[PDB]
Amino acid sequence: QNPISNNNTATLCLGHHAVANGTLVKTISDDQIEVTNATELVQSISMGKICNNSYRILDGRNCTLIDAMLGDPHCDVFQYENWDLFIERSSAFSNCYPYDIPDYASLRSIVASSGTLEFTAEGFTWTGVTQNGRSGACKRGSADSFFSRLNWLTKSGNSYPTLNVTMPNNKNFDKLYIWGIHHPSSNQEQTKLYIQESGRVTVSTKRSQQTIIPNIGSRPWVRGQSGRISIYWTIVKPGDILMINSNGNLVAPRGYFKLKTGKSSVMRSDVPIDICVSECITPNGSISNEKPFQNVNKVTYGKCPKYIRQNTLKLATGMRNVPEK
Amino acid sequence: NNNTATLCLGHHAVANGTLVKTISDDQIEVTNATELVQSISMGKICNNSYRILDGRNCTLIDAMLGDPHCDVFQYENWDLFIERSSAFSNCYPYDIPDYASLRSIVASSGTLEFTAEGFTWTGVTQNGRSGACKRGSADSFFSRLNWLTKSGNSYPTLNVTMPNNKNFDKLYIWGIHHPSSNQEQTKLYIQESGRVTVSTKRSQQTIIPNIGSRPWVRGQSGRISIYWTIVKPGDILMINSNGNLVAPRGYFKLKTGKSSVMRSDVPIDICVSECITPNGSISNEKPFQNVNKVTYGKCPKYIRQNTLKLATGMRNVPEK
Amino acid sequence: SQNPISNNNTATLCLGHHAVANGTLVKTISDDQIEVTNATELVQSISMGKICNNSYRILDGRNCTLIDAMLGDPHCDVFQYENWDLFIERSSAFSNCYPYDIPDYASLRSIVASSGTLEFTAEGFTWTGVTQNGRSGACKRGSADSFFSRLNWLTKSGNSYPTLNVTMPNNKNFDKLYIWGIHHPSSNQEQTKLYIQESGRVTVSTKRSQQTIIPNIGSRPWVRGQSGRISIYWTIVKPGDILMINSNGNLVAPRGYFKLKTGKSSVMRSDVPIDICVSECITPNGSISNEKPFQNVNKVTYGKCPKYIRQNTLKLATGMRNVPE
Amino acid sequence: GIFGAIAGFIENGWEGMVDGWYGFRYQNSEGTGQAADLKSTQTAIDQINEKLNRVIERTNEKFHQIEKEFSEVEGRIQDLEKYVEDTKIDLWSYNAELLVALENQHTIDLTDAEMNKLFEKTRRQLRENAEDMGGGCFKIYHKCDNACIGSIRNGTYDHYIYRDEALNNRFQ
Amino acid sequence: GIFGAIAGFIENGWEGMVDGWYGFRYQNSEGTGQAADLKSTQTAIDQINEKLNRVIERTNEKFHQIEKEFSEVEGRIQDLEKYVEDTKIDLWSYNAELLVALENQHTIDLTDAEMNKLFEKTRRQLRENAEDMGGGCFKIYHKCDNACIGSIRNGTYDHYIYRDEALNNRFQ
Amino acid sequence: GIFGAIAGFIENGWEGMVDGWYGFRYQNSEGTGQAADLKSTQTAIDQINEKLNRVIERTNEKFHQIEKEFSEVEGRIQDLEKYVEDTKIDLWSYNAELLVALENQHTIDLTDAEMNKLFEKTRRQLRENAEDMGGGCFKIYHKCDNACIGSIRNGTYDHYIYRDEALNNRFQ
């Protein structure tokens, strides 16, 4: 009661710190509760550019991966390239013979994952035909040309003999062979180029085969051409053999691509590539990977935070903040 | 005793509590709990929030092609198309390679908006018909398809083009007739073997008919095979054929939709609901449901459990 | 409070908890590592090194794939009318009949595996105007040229092969599986010798489905004396539906159907031995104990199995914090 | 519960406590009475109310998905569709089971905590003027009529007023 | 731990306590003793025994599933198969890691709580007849033979019998 | 919070305490002062710092996956690809939401626990020499200079030497 503390007493008070400006977090108990400090767990900002300092980034520029593989002339710079990540641009275009690839997406995936365009020519012998067919749809310089990796065969004299060739795989890796069939625009064109009215391509290994027939008919002109080539592929394992048998329309392989089991990929993005430090790439550019989550893009490559829908998640790093007064 | 007092602290209890599970206990009694799993449906599909289209005796595909008994479905749109298990085909027997994909693409787009186009078919007979496909008790055909046959003793190579000068994607449905015999082939098309090539700048399809008997369906042992082609703005459709073409009459408008298709036999009626399942609409108040893994709309999550009780009150410790 | 001998008129009462000399470390939300009195391992990382034969019916394929047993490759004759919960395919398995391929092999294998039976019923197909029961030196059964037991290789009779047209209704209450094929001859001479027609064709249909295959004449790699191939296809006929077969050459005909069941069966690739023991969970590494909730042995499992996770160890506390004396 | 108040040092609940989840019963010179404690009640209710909304996002629209029922046997693609769906359902079923058990544990604990807190709050007010009798009851060692009980209820009890009386009653 | 009993105000555990998890040691005129407390022990054991089963089913029966290993490069369908499986495995691996961390935290918390609860229960019985000396020990300020200790252990100690004696000893 | 210390029996925090999370203020004949408690501070910080590392695996490299954006409609395979990815994202988004709420709850609860534990530790040291004033303050009933306060802070306070003095002040 005495206003002055007796000398034979003391007061001891227990307490905790507080800060003037706390921050709000969510718990199991409370929609919002103020804590002394919190940290952001969601990366929502990108670097606006793709960093090329950790992973080997290859800019496709005007070329798709497939066109670089086939050897579209404007893609010649890409011969024998390799990558961790191949960047495909929305403005890429094809500029050779018009073509399609049944299951295009699978071939793109296989090559992208392999991470290389290491190509090796092989000594195929094509008895009794003319090799190195070319087209005005595909200029290399100012000269009619063709996909560098394919060999467009046509008749010699008045005949196109049944082609029958073999190529054993005596290496220790998978060989990828790319080949095709030409689809003429008319019966007249078919017999003109290949003699046989009904073309056929059979590509086989010991335990698999692909049997293809040409498709004949008028189609919309693309670079002056109503004809088309359809592209196919065949993987030959070590100890297996490749066989090609055709009585017309064959667009022959010139060799093989080396297939690797890689950590490579392909990504669609229009963002510039520059010098900087990042271990995670998205179509929006590289991002920091300090945080466990990100809301930048579900498409990622590298050492990346997990994509989630939320744009912010605040983790408390301090106690409940209870300011004075 | 006036010189003292007693003050007791306590908490409430109820005569009738309810059992829940915790991390600590398989079952413990609390004062109150609530069910989190929706296990009861309305037994009917409510048609008030989403546009529900009852297919009745028609599949979506048959409505698309214009099977005569599906003529009511012309130019319809939906959030959810409902297919009944008793739906049936009643036209020329057909198949569609990748049927499931066409059905999905159309279901998703959510419209059957069709626009006729002025295809010229020089030198052939148009509007072929069949006893397999009766309309008004007379031989007929799919409303959206145009069965071409010889004119006189000729069937010239057809070669036609249709530019897409619109700003949306066009969907073209077309087909090829597989006759039951060489006699029918030459009778209808002159040529001993037909061919249909449908292409654009970025895709091509060439189909050859296969002659022979398939099982009798509505008088017919032949078949039509159905195909589709999408033509983007700026692109052009080309059709080339020397026989057996079942031609398109125009195009369907494709749009980016939030629509779907669902199989159900329950009635469609007026009621309040935002979640549809094959068993009927269900309330969406609860976070979970065990009615059906198939849903459309604003739906609770499907889980295996038929009941989950959330405590809404303290441990219940009744008096003796 | 010294007093060497405690006071008779007071007592001391201490409260405590137990401890063990050798605790074990676990992880909590609060601590990277904290010592507890005991813990239990939740990840099964050890297999029995063999597949137990006693809970589920295990069938050892030995030298045969499930597909070869289905087709009736002679060295697989012992597998006729077999059934299984789990079919084990060995990596040493081989084919020893006419060389063949199955487009979508994986799907047919899955369908048969799941059904869990090779129950086969012959049917009275009538093959008018052709020779039945073709044999090949590529497919010896004992000392005789033979063929897949479940297929019927048709060839010309006299100097003719008429257009075959056969039917078989399904008046049963289950789905029938028909396996059938087409021969791709290696040469034109062989084509006309066997089938007269210069080009054959097979159309197999039901009320609601159809498949047409045209052969492709030409050389494939020599396998057991043959540069030709058979391609295998299947058709599933539902109750009330009807099988139709149409061919003017090259048909490798079904002899009947396999009964399909809605089963709980599967197939697994493993090279470990099968033996007497009790277990309810099988992996390619062998049977595993299923007392634990998780396992890190193999992502491929069958039966009553712990969930596969990436961690090789997870310790669950079964006691209080251990605070040794 | 971890605090050992509910189903602990408090033997049972009161069915007759209708206007609160927690409260007081008392006997003094003026008879017997009961009163609810509003703050403790409100604190528990606020934590329990719509508690799942803190973890489960508001149900949003889903539209076209994958097929989940099949009328034909198909093999590989169908196997994958069925596997994807089963995988999803089993993951959500686990999430549901865990969430409910965790939330229920939290509800049991927080309500036990509120009971304990109210007890401790009351104990601190009474200082040296009362003893814990067990069972959640305090023996108050002075004359303590309804206004005095009321002062405890509203947190304004002044122990110094009664300390001499109480100390004498406790330790004589 | 959150209650600060185990590895807290109790300095260490007792390796010589073999027939219970919690208990008492005592010294009086008759000598020294030890006795397990069975109720606190059982409470802790019941909560810990097969606790995972409250949230996860032991093992689930599964049959035919998708392929998970591949002998050929195939592209799109195979990419999807692998992605589905990897996605599933990472999600379950996360579930396993969190579950074990949460359950271990709960076990530590509940065992610490039982220790605290036993101490508080004993404190409540003793009323004014004993003081907490720290270390989890009470000094009992009266003659307290084995029968008396027994009455504390079975919750029948009547503080009133001994209060005058204890108060005289405490305040001298 | 569950212990009722922070935002509870302690009215508010001290913005003027910058060298610790928990601590003491005192007043005696030598004046007033303040000092941080390092052990309670460290215990809280150790539990909080990088706490997610206990449940969230070190981020690993992922490489080629499935396509997640599509320029044309395709039907069945694309529907499945999209559904798989949507399913994955929804499950991880839920995991993230739950983890953060659980961690935050745990952080609030463990810091409240440290506050209560420091208070109980101090109470036990003081024995019969002090009373709990409420508000987290002790009235110490003997002369208690800065060295004496220091012995309380470093846990070496000897209640025995001040007991006679303290009891006489408390009760007379």
Ligand SMILES: *[C@@H]1O[C@H](CO[C@H]2O[C@@H](C)[C@@H](O)[C@@H](O)[C@@H]2O)[C@@H](O[C@@H]2O[C@H](CO)[C@@H](O[C@@H]3O[C@H](CO[C@H]4O[C@H](CO)[C@@H](O)[C@H](O)[C@@H]4O)[C@@H](O)[C@H](O[C@H]4O[C@H](CO)[C@@H](O)[C@H](O)[C@@H]4O)[C@@H]3O)[C@H](O)[C@H]2NC(C)=O)[C@H](O)[C@H]1NC(C)=O
């Ligand atoms: C609080 O009080 C609740 C109300 O029940 C009472 O109603 C009042 C007015 C009085 O008349 C009471 O005498 C009467 O019992 C208690 O709820 C009841 O709890 C029991 C379990 O303890 C439930 O039993 C289950 O019944 C199922 C029957 O199906 C339906 O039938 C009733 C109508 O009679 C419906 O309302 C229900 O919703 C049911 O859907 C049955 O399927 C179950 O069988 C299974 O389990 C038993 C073992 O328990 C086993 O033998 C058997 O093989 C099955 O595996 C089960 O028997 C009862 O449904 C339920 N009644 C209501 C209306 O909810 C409640 O227990 C009580 N709470 C506490 C803590 O005591």
Ligand SMILES: *[C@@H]1O[C@H](CO)[C@@H](O[C@@H]2O[C@H](CO)[C@@H](O[C@@H]3O[C@H](CO[C@H]4O[C@H](CO)[C@@H](O)[C@H](O)[C@@H]4O)[C@@H](O)[C@H](O[C@H]4O[C@H](CO)[C@@H](O)[C@H](O)[C@@H]4O)[C@@H]3O)[C@H](O)[C@H]2NC(C)=O)[C@H](O)[C@H]1NC(C)=O
């Ligand atoms: C089936 O039907 C299709 C569709 O009608 C026919 O395909 C057309 O075939 C003709 C040639 O026979 C093509 O016509 C040629 O087009 C060339 C390219 O056009 C450019 O310029 C126009 C602007 O007017 C743009 O539309 C376009 O983008 C191009 O930039 C022209 O270079 C040609 O002109 C020159 O050709 C003649 C000879 O034909 C020369 O003597 C002259 O120098 C002349 O200037 C020509 O007009 C047309 O492109 C094709 N259309 C399509 C969509 O493919 C098939 O021929 C038909 N099949 C059968 C069997 O009848």
Ligand SMILES: *[C@@H]1O[C@H](CO)[C@@H](O[C@@H]2O[C@H](CO)[C@@H](O[C@@H]3O[C@H](CO[C@H]4O[C@H](CO)[C@@H](O)[C@H](O)[C@@H]4O)[C@@H](O)[C@H](O[C@H]4O[C@H](CO)[C@@H](O)[C@H](O)[C@@H]4O)[C@@H]3O)[C@H](O)[C@H]2NC(C)=O)[C@H](O)[C@H]1NC(C)=O
């Ligand atoms: C290849 O081989 C197949 C298989 O044999 C042949 O296909 C059969 O062809 C015949 C001839 O067209 C078909 O016969 C028809 O069957 C119809 C369906 O029968 C069902 O429904 C009737 C109800 O009327 C029941 O009686 C019966 O139990 C069945 O449930 C009948 O409706 C037809 O009868 C009508 O037409 C005839 C015309 O002769 C009239 O006389 C009758 O009055 C009646 O109006 C008819 O009999 C048979 O359906 C086909 N079977 C299959 C499985 O397809 C192919 O012909 C053959 N191909 C070649 C080139 O040879």
Ligand SMILES: *[C@@H]1O[C@H](CO)[C@@H](O[C@@H]2O[C@H](CO)[C@@H](O[C@@H]3O[C@H](CO[C@H]4O[C@H](CO)[C@@H](O)[C@H](O)[C@@H]4O)[C@@H](O)[C@H](O[C@H]4O[C@H](CO)[C@@H](O)[C@H](O)[C@@H]4O)[C@@H]3O)[C@H](O)[C@H]2NC(C)=O)[C@H](O)[C@H]1NC(C)=O
């Ligand atoms: C298209 O092109 C291909 C590739 O050249 C041709 O296919 C080859 O055709 C020949 C002729 O049939 C095949 O020759 C056969 O080879 C077998 C070899 O297998 C292994 O074992 C022998 C040891 O005997 C080794 O020499 C060899 O390296 C292999 O390791 C032999 O078994 C056969 O040889 C002889 O067997 C009998 C004994 O029973 C002898 O009496 C005969 O002399 C017989 O010749 C046989 O010669 C060769 O295998 C094919 N290669 C491939 C890769 O398929 C096509 O023929 C061609 N097509 C056309 C239409 O021209």
Ligand SMILES: *[C@@H]1O[C@H](CO)[C@@H](O[C@@H]2O[C@H](CO)[C@@H](O[C@@H]3O[C@H](CO)[C@@H](O)[C@H](O)[C@@H]3O)[C@H](O)[C@H]2NC(C)=O)[C@H](O)[C@H]1NC(C)=O
């Ligand atoms: C036992 O627990 C259940 C928890 O489900 C309690 O029922 C819930 O009570 C609240 C408040 O009355 C209801 O919310 C109200 O909803 C209406 C319209 O929907 C709205 O206008 C009000 O403003 C209010 O939000 C809630 O719907 C209801 N939930 C259920 C499933 O019935 C019940 O009150 C508890 N009983 C006791 C005694 O505490």
Ligand SMILES: *[C@@H]1O[C@H](CO)[C@@H](O[C@@H]2O[C@H](CO)[C@@H](O[C@@H]3O[C@H](CO)[C@@H](O)[C@H](O)[C@@H]3O)[C@H](O)[C@H]2NC(C)=O)[C@H](O)[C@H]1NC(C)=O
């Ligand atoms: C939801 O479904 C209900 C029920 O199916 C729809 O109401 C029904 O609509 C039909 C046809 O549109 C109505 O038929 C009409 O009725 C008169 C006489 O009643 C008839 O002479 C007309 O020729 C006309 O066809 C019918 O009355 C009505 N049925 C019922 C049972 O209510 C409703 O349109 C649907 N709602 C939405 C928003 O889609």
Ligand SMILES: *[C@@H]1O[C@H](CO[C@H]2O[C@@H](C)[C@@H](O)[C@@H](O)[C@@H]2O)[C@@H](O[C@@H]2O[C@H](CO)[C@@H](O)[C@H](O)[C@H]2NC(C)=O)[C@H](O)[C@H]1NC(C)=O
């Ligand atoms: C806190 O309570 C005291 C004690 O007495 C009251 O108890 C209350 C819970 C209430 O039910 C009331 O009816 C009862 O009187 C209050 O003191 C009393 O206040 C009333 C007016 O509200 C006066 O009439 C009395 O004279 C007065 N008596 C004494 C001894 O103080 C007090 O006002 C109340 N204060 C607050 C801030 O809530």
Ligand SMILES: *[C@@H]1O[C@H](CO[C@H]2O[C@@H](C)[C@@H](O)[C@@H](O)[C@@H]2O)[C@@H](O[C@@H]2O[C@H](CO)[C@@H](O)[C@H](O)[C@H]2NC(C)=O)[C@H](O)[C@H]1NC(C)=O
């Ligand atoms: C609680 O214990 C008391 C006394 O102490 C007992 O402690 C027990 C654990 C046991 O070891 C026992 O041998 C020991 O006596 C019990 O009261 C006593 O019971 C005995 C025989 O029933 C009598 O001879 C004593 O006079 C009696 N003491 C008193 C003061 O009545 C008591 O039975 C026990 N209560 C319960 C409910 O278990």
Ligand SMILES: *[C@@H]1O[C@H](CO)[C@@H](O[C@@H]2O[C@H](CO)[C@@H](O)[C@H](O)[C@H]2NC(C)=O)[C@H](O)[C@H]1NC(C)=O
């Ligand atoms: C990263 O790039 C993607 C791709 O455009 C952006 O995602 C789009 O966001 C816009 C604006 O909200 C929407 O119109 C689209 O629905 C999104 N997707 C696509 C495929 O267009 C994303 O916002 C970008 N993030 C950045 C720049 O930080």
Ligand SMILES: *[C@@H]1O[C@H](CO)[C@@H](O[C@@H]2O[C@H](CO)[C@@H](O)[C@H](O)[C@H]2NC(C)=O)[C@H](O)[C@H]1NC(C)=O
């Ligand atoms: C909703 O309807 C489905 C069928 O679409 C029901 O699922 C069946 O349930 C029965 C038991 O009630 C099982 O025997 C069948 O095997 C199930 N069929 C299928 C195809 O799954 C389901 O019970 C209904 N759900 C309700 C009414 O809540």
Ligand SMILES: *[C@@H]1O[C@H](CO)[C@@H](O[C@@H]2O[C@H](CO)[C@@H](O)[C@H](O)[C@H]2NC(C)=O)[C@H](O)[C@H]1NC(C)=O
């Ligand atoms: C400590 O825990 C272990 C489990 O980690 C227990 O030992 C197991 O006991 C079970 C059932 O009796 C046996 O199936 C296992 O073979 C044992 N495993 C190991 C690794 O030893 C043990 O019971 C516990 N020990 C104590 C003293 O409680």
Ligand SMILES: *[C@@H]1O[C@H](CO)[C@@H](O[C@@H]2O[C@H](CO)[C@@H](O)[C@H](O)[C@H]2NC(C)=O)[C@H](O)[C@H]1NC(C)=O
């Ligand atoms: C698993 O399968 C069965 C029992 O389920 C057993 O096979 C028989 O036992 C021995 C193998 O040691 C053979 O001599 C018999 O011929 C088998 N029986 C038949 C009918 O063939 C065997 O115990 C188990 N293991 C193996 C490898 O078969």
Ligand SMILES: *[C@@H]1O[C@H](CO[C@H]2O[C@@H](C)[C@@H](O)[C@@H](O)[C@@H]2O)[C@@H](O)[C@H](O)[C@H]1NC(C)=O
């Ligand atoms: C324990 O405290 C004793 C009291 O005096 C000191 O308290 C310290 C905490 C510090 O603030 C000094 O400035 C005070 O003078 C002291 O004599 C003992 O040496 C202390 N022992 C230890 C190990 O801290």
Ligand SMILES: *[C@@H]1O[C@H](CO)[C@@H](O)[C@H](O)[C@H]1NC(C)=O
């Ligand atoms: C603990 O392990 C030691 C090995 O260091 C061994 O001697 C014994 O088995 C255990 N000790 C005790 C006291 O049980």
